[PDB]
Amino acid sequence: QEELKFKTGLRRLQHRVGEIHLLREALQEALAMLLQETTGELEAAKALVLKRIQIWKRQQQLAGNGAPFEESLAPLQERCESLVDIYSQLQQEVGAAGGELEPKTRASLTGRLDEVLRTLVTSCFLVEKQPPQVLKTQTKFQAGVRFLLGLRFPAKPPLVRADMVTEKQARELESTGEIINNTVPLENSIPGNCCSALFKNLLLKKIKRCETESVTEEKCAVLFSASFTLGPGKLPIQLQALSLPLVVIVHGNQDNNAKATILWDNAFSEMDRVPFVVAERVPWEKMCETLNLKFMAEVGTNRGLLPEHFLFLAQKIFNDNSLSMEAFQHRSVSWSQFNKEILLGRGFTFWQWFDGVLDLTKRCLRSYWSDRLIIGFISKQYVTSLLLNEPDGTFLLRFSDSEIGGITIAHVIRGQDGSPQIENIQPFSAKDLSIRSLGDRIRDLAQLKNLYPKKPKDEAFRSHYKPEQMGKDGRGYVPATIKMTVE
Amino acid sequence: QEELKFKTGLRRLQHRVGEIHLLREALAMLLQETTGELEAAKALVLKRIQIWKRQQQLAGNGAPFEESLAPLQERCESLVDIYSQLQQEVGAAGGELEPKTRASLTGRLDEVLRTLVTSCFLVEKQPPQVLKTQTKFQAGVRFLLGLRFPAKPPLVRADMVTEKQARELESTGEIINNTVPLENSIPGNCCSALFKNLLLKKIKRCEGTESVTEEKCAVLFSASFTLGPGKLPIQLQALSLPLVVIVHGNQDNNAKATILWDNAFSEMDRVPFVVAERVPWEKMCETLNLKFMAEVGTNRGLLPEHFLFLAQKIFNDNSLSMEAFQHRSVSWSQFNKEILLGRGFTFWQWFDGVLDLTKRCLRSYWSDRLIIGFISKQYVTSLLLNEPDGTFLLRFSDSEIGGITIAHVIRGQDGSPQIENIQPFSAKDLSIRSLGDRIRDLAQLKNLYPKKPKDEAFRSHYKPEQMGKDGRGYVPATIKMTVE
Amino acid sequence: QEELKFKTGLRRLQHRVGEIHLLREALALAMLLQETTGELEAAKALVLKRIQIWKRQQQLAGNGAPFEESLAPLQERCESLVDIYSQLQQEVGAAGGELEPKTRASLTGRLDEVLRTLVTSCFLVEKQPPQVLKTQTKFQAGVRFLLGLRFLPAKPPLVRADMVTEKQARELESTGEIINNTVPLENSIPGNCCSALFKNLLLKKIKRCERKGTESVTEEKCAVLFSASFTLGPGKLPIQLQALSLPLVVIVHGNQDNNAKATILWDNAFSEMDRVPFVVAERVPWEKMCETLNLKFMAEVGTNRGLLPEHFLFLAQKIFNDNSLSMEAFQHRSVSWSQFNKEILLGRGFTFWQWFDGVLDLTKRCLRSYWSDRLIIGFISKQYVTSLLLNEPDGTFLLRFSDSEIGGITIAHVIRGQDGSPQIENIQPFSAKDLSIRSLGDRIRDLAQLKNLYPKKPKDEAFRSHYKPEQMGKDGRGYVPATIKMTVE
Amino acid sequence: QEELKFKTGLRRLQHRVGEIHLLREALEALAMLLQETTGELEAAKALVLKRIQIWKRQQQLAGNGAPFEESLAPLQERCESLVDIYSQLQQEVGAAGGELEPKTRASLTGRLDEVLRTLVTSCFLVEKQPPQVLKTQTKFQAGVRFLLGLRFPAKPPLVRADMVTEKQARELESTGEIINNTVPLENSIPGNCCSALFKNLLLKKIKRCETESVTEEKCAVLFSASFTLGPGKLPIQLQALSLPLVVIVHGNQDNNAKATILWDNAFSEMDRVPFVVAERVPWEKMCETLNLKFMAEVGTNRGLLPEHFLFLAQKIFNDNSLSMEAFQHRSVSWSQFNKEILLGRGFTFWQWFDGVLDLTKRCLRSYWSDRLIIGFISKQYVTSLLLNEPDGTFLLRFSDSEIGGITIAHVIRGGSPQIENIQPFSAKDLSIRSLGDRIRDLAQLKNLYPKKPKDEAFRSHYKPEQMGKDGRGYVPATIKMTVE
DNA sequence: TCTGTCTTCCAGGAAATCCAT
DNA sequence: ATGGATTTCCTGGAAGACAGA
DNA sequence: ATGGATTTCCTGGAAGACAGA
DNA sequence: TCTGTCTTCCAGGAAATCCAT
């Protein structure tokens, strides 16, 4: 760990402040005018903590896209409080003596010190609960900011305002839409041991869009503004904190495309960058990492995609028919390839498809998938090759490549004299499975004997069968049920 | 017709104005005093107006409507014409002895004028009788004498009033876009103001046992002129039919019933908005039959047997003769306020349940008279035990809101013939697979009661099997229905 | 085609008979191949089914629908099959000794069975009698025997015809008897046909089965039965040939014709392939009724273009007493036989069919030309004409069939211009007699007030072709022509 | 008159039979002289027979509409009287005896049974003759009467009816057969008549001998019977022949057939051998018959005039002469009447005449009886008649060029006057729109020749027209007539 | 015991046959 | 070359027979 | 001919606010 | 106190407008 080295380094500063106090006491100057040069060590530690803050912010960006998170944000508050503590004792020691230390340096010392105070508090202003990165108009949402140094400061609490800014407006350094209930006091919770402002009720009334772009790919953020003074008055500092970039939508149907933009950004945003610039193309392998993470995060599964899958995916998106997991790995993929370009005569983009299967699996197949009963991704070619060698009654489940959000059964026919020929059942949508679960639909069909390979259907899907009640309840009404057939 | 009598009497009136005009060649007269008979004609056209309003009220429920409102405007125009000629004839006279008779006459004349104009202000296009908040709707008024009264259009205003506020003679909920000019369309030969865009933002409800959804309101149209000879001021006001305003779809049903009750049984010219608490069950049957045929969209509706079953249900009566119920009365509380024994819903809620089900999914099957629709489990058991194996019928579920169920007969010979009742189908159930198709699926079902063979009956409702292949490269997967 | 499937399979059969003949060079389980060469039975089943199809086509032809008349290739199929049967039987017959005794017998059984069924199915009614048939009036009928050119030479058989009722036809006497009911089944080499034609036939008296439920006499169905026999060596199994006609309804006077027609129409339209004689459904999909009605209209009128969606809507309304206004409401509907011809229209004194056939005869007799010119709306409801014509100018008119009269057509026109409000007037309907006196075109010419045919066609332009020329010349001799024109007051 | 001659002469005979009874009772030459009164009886018999022949002749004349004393009741009475005195007288010879004057007594029985025989054989009459023009495969009737039937009981004798030809009838090869030709001669006491009526007679088919022509072959039905009345037996065979008839196969032969029959009935010689009739006749008698038949078939009380007969003579004789006295002593042949085409026409005189007969009977009886029709004229004489007349004068004449057509001639305009003849109207034309109505339509027709106004003349023949709107919604469409 | 269904009777139009023009 | 003559077939009008209620 | 993109209307599910029994 | 009444909130069909390089 990196964490302990820090406190030892802090121990040094506490010893340092003790020393200077003791000295300014006994005096009452050649050096210790020079001991004040140890506030450089303070400003050093501070910078470190600031970088540390940046690291968390990056971790937050990746939380969207579901990456493990040390979300707590509680100890950083302690680090900062400690720093402002020794700032306090330093400025105070400068306060006395009081003629036992050279006056010209008073300006330099107070200068660096109020400087580090300034920068620290302006950077201790964090968005802790980010607003939804994909955000629908006329729908209520929340966001919450946190001030780490609130617990050390009583003068009237400042009020944080939230305002819609565009990427253009955000670079700098007319409303573009008004936000209701965007006035909240930055309140101080002693039992929560936190200083925070939560906007439990936020609404976006109207929306204004700049002018290929697709609207959806238009990024904005909310600006949290505040100001508060510390007596002696005033030299008031204006606090502002920006959110992660968000896409504003008007209806559910835009959700898919929007998700992609945010996804992309979250993955590939620079740790330090201009709002809101991101790369044009990326390594295909890191894209594989992101796709796996989002898959596992949204489906709600502990185990996700495999190499063969990634291969099939590469094949799909690149239109490359290659067979080696090593050919594609050293390749770049652009955003336009990802979500802007139609693929292979189909009517939809790669992402639109992937998000399709994502929704299908989350909604109806999570159980089956975690049970590793679905191959999920393959070429029709590879099912023909894999299944022709298999006996009559062997089948497998694959995602439909032609329909968005569909899953289809492939099985082997026929036994004995006819040479085996493979059949593909038309895909099931989320609705089709809501009407009758995949497991049960599978149950109806007697003709498939084994799930590829060598696993018999009855053993595999025991847990997914819905029990048929039997009986006449009630009262008088014999249950009517639907089974599924092919011919 | 009474309409024709009107024409006869009016021809008499113009002949009469001819009489007085020629009599003015004096240059005694009780002729204009008996020509005070104009007031009679006025009363008659006013009655006819009352009748048209009643027809529109009954139009609220599905009914025939003579909507035209053109002949009425014509009648009115004719009458204010003879009034005009009358007044002008009275004006130009010596031998107005005594002058007091000039006074009494002028009084009578401008009085009938006033009452005529106050009665010519009609709601031609009524607002929706059950009305949801923050939703756009329309309404339009008509003034029959607008073509005679050029000055600037008045611009009628529409305001939400409550029943309490309506008896009389604030801000209960307000309406945006509630100001429209009363325009005079010469190509239409009509004076009318249509509110093409109206919306109600908020609603505040009067206050104990009765549910909100029976609270009646109306929109009030106000206007004024300010028509020559000046001043001649008279304010026009017209009330709409009573309406019930709702906040969400889930109240719709309960709302409809209130309006229905009101439209069917509102007395002519009642104080707003009184209606009887109980009515003859027969008239209720007429109303129910009408509403059923109207909402389903069918020319053939309920039968004696049906009405009997309904009477048994609503009265909790075990009687078996159709004549027992005929001289019976039925209350509003029975109609929509009393839960049905052992059930979770009121009678209206159930009836409208089947209304919605049939409208949505069964209109065709019903029109083909393949559904009994109404029948008790008992009578089906009795009817079906004597029938052979595989004989079935369709009946509405008594237990579920908006459900239809199959009752069939199976005889094993070894085991005595017994009735089986398939679980009822909801509208969703039928959207997933059609009734015809479902019936096709069940092989055991042989004959629709009585005699009719099932395929012959349901030929027209079977969906064709697509079979074949696609798309592309994909074999169709189909869902069929079974019982075990 | 099915034809190609047949010829390929037949080529296979002849190749197989080649194989078996050659296997006889052994002179085995190769006659187990003989047991699969019993696959001839498949081909038999196929040609029989095709016969069934031809019979069905004839049935629908009787209703004015397209027909493939020929029956020559079918006879060829039959000849081919009895040929391969013949060589097969001769092959089983020859080389008996090696042959297992049970197998030879079982085979012979299977084979002569397929022969028997083939010939019992080769006796067809080729020229049907009239489906609606009047007593003591001459009609004709003709049967054909497809295998007649093979068995004939022996003397030609009698081929007598007898009137049977539906009752008698189910089974499996003398309801009414017929003169000239015996003909020789002659063998015409120039025609390549064995056929027996009844050039002369007359039905003298009809005794009618007993009816209940008000079942009108005119819906009682009967047929004529053709019987014949040989007695053809290879003896000695004389097999009796019988063939039934299409069901027909026999009437006594013209006034029944109309009702008779419907009974036939329904049956022809909807008889379910093979059935016990003579059952047909009581109710059918309204769409199929529309198909049949369209077909019959075009057939009896004699026009290539018939009814439209809007017409069918009007008809659905009429027949169903329904006030619905959407063509989509009626589409998944059923219609019963009682509704079609047994239920009187509530306003009307007549049934739906009677009215419809009324317009059929009217258009046939006087209006085919006008209809083919698409100058007649033909089917409309006065309400819809009022709606359509009120917005139109003075002198705009249309032609619609009368709802109150059987076989009547009426003019609806729009008057009057300017101050008076527009009102629709309906001229009294014209009967066939009325039109014989003076043609529709001429009548329309006479009336000056109607200027435009709906929607915006000028009257003279549209009806130019139907105007009969007036004659300037006076004849004869010395006599000036007297002419009759039409007015309304 | 003759009735008296008979009854007084009969009183003589009865007085004498009383006389013989008294003298034979007084009891040889007496019987010889008293029997010579059977001489006055036999005289009387011949007399009554003549009266019968006269009636038979009148019946022949009954066709062509000549008044008829059809009754045949008094004649029966006369016959009954005669056989009554025959009976008692013959009986007197039998009873008075004892054997007196026997040798001659045999002779007595001879004369007596003779007069009885001739009497009964001549009392066998066809009372209801069959149609003289008779169609094959058609049901017809005929009835015979036996006048002495009430005096003769042994079973009624069979009466049979058979089709005979002229050749066969002379004497003294079925040639067409008759169904239902067997009827019993029944005796009606309440009707006081002995009769046999054949209500259901039909001629199945006919074979005709062979010059010219079809419709000229005359035939008859022969009624045969026998009794076989005591003293036995000397059975006497009764036969009666009908009037001559022409047998036709179709309606279109009717005209020609009629002529033949007409001729015969008019001109059949009394006592003539069947069935000879004259070849030519005086023209005046021909005019008489023509008038009789005209009034008879049209159904009118007043018929043809001198000028008409003149016009007819002119037509048939091809003569252009102008005096009614010229043609009067002329004779006309059968060939001229019906066997000869005239001039430019394709038809005979008779075919034309019966043509106008049918036209008038069918459509003009009313108009003709009202004397609004000239009926017969030449274009020549109408031109002479109308040129001098004012603008608007017209008349009606039968078409000479067409069979069964009537045409309007008028004098317009009216410029020198010039004459027009409208194309003739057939019976069909008049069925489509009545003559009266057609005349109404034409505005130019002002006066019926002469000095009579059209409106006054044809008021009653005008049909009232509505001229109303019904029904329902259907305005009547009417057909009028024009010429240019 | 009338209504309505069913039938038989009968007039006229179209047309086949033969003819002698 | 078509007119006449002589007959049969056959449609629809009209009215008679009859069964069902 | 047209398909896509972008927005609003409105229905019915679900759950939150709430008054009265 | 709490249940059932009443309301607000929000997802997703249709479907209107505009554009379409």
mmCIF file of C-alpha atoms in Angstrom, chain A residues 39-127:
data_model
loop_
_atom_site.group_PDB
_atom_site.id
_atom_site.type_symbol
_atom_site.label_atom_id
_atom_site.label_comp_id
_atom_site.label_asym_id
_atom_site.label_seq_id
_atom_site.Cartn_x
_atom_site.Cartn_y
_atom_site.Cartn_z
ATOM 1 C CA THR A 39 5.429 24.934 4.624
ATOM 2 C CA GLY A 40 6.769 23.909 1.249
ATOM 3 C CA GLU A 41 6.605 20.394 2.578
ATOM 4 C CA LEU A 42 3.021 21.202 3.445
ATOM 5 C CA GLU A 43 2.302 22.468 -0.041
ATOM 6 C CA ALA A 44 3.975 19.312 -1.314
ATOM 7 C CA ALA A 45 1.693 16.977 0.667
ATOM 8 C CA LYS A 46 -1.300 19.017 -0.425
ATOM 9 C CA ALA A 47 -0.485 18.565 -4.099
ATOM 10 C CA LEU A 48 -0.208 14.840 -3.479
ATOM 11 C CA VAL A 49 -3.648 14.759 -1.898
ATOM 12 C CA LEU A 50 -5.000 16.734 -4.854
ATOM 13 C CA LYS A 51 -3.651 14.164 -7.285
ATOM 14 C CA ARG A 52 -5.138 11.509 -5.056
ATOM 15 C CA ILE A 53 -8.489 13.279 -5.450
ATOM 16 C CA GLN A 54 -8.080 13.191 -9.223
ATOM 17 C CA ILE A 55 -7.529 9.445 -9.000
ATOM 18 C CA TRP A 56 -10.847 9.016 -7.202
ATOM 19 C CA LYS A 57 -12.646 11.149 -9.731
ATOM 20 C CA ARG A 58 -11.297 8.872 -12.449
ATOM 21 C CA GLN A 59 -12.514 5.841 -10.495
ATOM 22 C CA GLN A 60 -15.905 7.522 -10.335
ATOM 23 C CA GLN A 61 -15.967 8.030 -14.087
ATOM 24 C CA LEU A 62 -15.339 4.307 -14.499
ATOM 25 C CA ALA A 63 -18.028 3.419 -11.931
ATOM 26 C CA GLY A 64 -20.417 4.326 -14.712
ATOM 27 C CA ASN A 65 -19.646 1.271 -16.810
ATOM 28 C CA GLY A 66 -19.626 -0.698 -13.535
ATOM 29 C CA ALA A 67 -16.012 -0.947 -12.300
ATOM 30 C CA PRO A 68 -15.319 -1.907 -8.656
ATOM 31 C CA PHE A 69 -15.243 1.239 -6.569
ATOM 32 C CA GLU A 70 -13.733 2.250 -3.269
ATOM 33 C CA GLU A 71 -16.718 4.574 -3.204
ATOM 34 C CA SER A 72 -16.422 5.593 0.393
ATOM 35 C CA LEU A 73 -14.719 9.010 -0.022
ATOM 36 C CA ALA A 74 -14.631 9.232 3.780
ATOM 37 C CA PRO A 75 -10.845 9.065 4.467
ATOM 38 C CA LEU A 76 -9.864 11.733 1.898
ATOM 39 C CA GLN A 77 -11.940 14.052 4.057
ATOM 40 C CA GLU A 78 -9.706 13.157 7.000
ATOM 41 C CA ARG A 79 -6.533 13.760 4.978
ATOM 42 C CA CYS A 80 -7.790 17.203 3.933
ATOM 43 C CA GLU A 81 -8.978 18.120 7.448
ATOM 44 C CA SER A 82 -5.502 17.206 8.769
ATOM 45 C CA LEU A 83 -3.870 19.446 6.168
ATOM 46 C CA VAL A 84 -6.115 22.426 6.978
ATOM 47 C CA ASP A 85 -5.297 21.739 10.623
ATOM 48 C CA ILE A 86 -1.570 22.256 10.255
ATOM 49 C CA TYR A 87 -2.338 25.181 7.930
ATOM 50 C CA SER A 88 -4.243 26.628 10.882
ATOM 51 C CA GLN A 89 -1.426 26.174 13.405
ATOM 52 C CA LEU A 90 1.093 27.570 10.895
ATOM 53 C CA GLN A 91 -0.836 30.742 10.068
ATOM 54 C CA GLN A 92 -1.390 31.104 13.830
ATOM 55 C CA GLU A 93 2.321 30.758 14.637
ATOM 56 C CA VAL A 94 3.034 33.358 11.968
ATOM 57 C CA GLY A 95 0.416 35.433 13.780
ATOM 58 C CA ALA A 96 2.465 35.650 16.960
ATOM 59 C CA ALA A 97 6.090 36.767 16.649
ATOM 60 C CA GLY A 98 5.247 39.454 16.306
ATOM 61 C CA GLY A 99 8.634 40.983 15.619
ATOM 62 C CA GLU A 100 10.830 37.964 16.371
ATOM 63 C CA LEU A 101 10.809 37.041 12.696
ATOM 64 C CA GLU A 102 11.505 39.205 9.615
ATOM 65 C CA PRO A 103 8.492 41.315 8.358
ATOM 66 C CA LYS A 104 9.245 41.291 4.574
ATOM 67 C CA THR A 105 8.736 37.516 4.580
ATOM 68 C CA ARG A 106 5.287 38.042 6.165
ATOM 69 C CA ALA A 107 3.903 38.717 2.710
ATOM 70 C CA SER A 108 5.591 35.681 1.154
ATOM 71 C CA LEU A 109 4.484 33.284 3.904
ATOM 72 C CA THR A 110 0.890 34.501 4.210
ATOM 73 C CA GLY A 111 0.860 34.464 0.428
ATOM 74 C CA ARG A 112 1.756 30.798 -0.001
ATOM 75 C CA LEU A 113 -0.460 29.822 2.913
ATOM 76 C CA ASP A 114 -3.689 31.549 1.795
ATOM 77 C CA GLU A 115 -2.784 30.219 -1.643
ATOM 78 C CA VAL A 116 -2.763 26.575 -0.502
ATOM 79 C CA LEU A 117 -5.936 27.218 1.513
ATOM 80 C CA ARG A 118 -7.555 28.658 -1.615
ATOM 81 C CA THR A 119 -6.612 25.808 -3.897
ATOM 82 C CA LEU A 120 -7.471 23.185 -1.281
ATOM 83 C CA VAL A 121 -10.997 24.452 -0.645
ATOM 84 C CA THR A 122 -11.672 25.111 -4.340
ATOM 85 C CA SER A 123 -10.675 21.474 -4.953
ATOM 86 C CA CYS A 124 -12.468 20.023 -1.908
ATOM 87 C CA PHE A 125 -15.750 20.771 -3.710
ATOM 88 C CA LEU A 126 -16.895 17.433 -5.182
ATOM 89 C CA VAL A 127 -19.929 15.968 -6.951
#
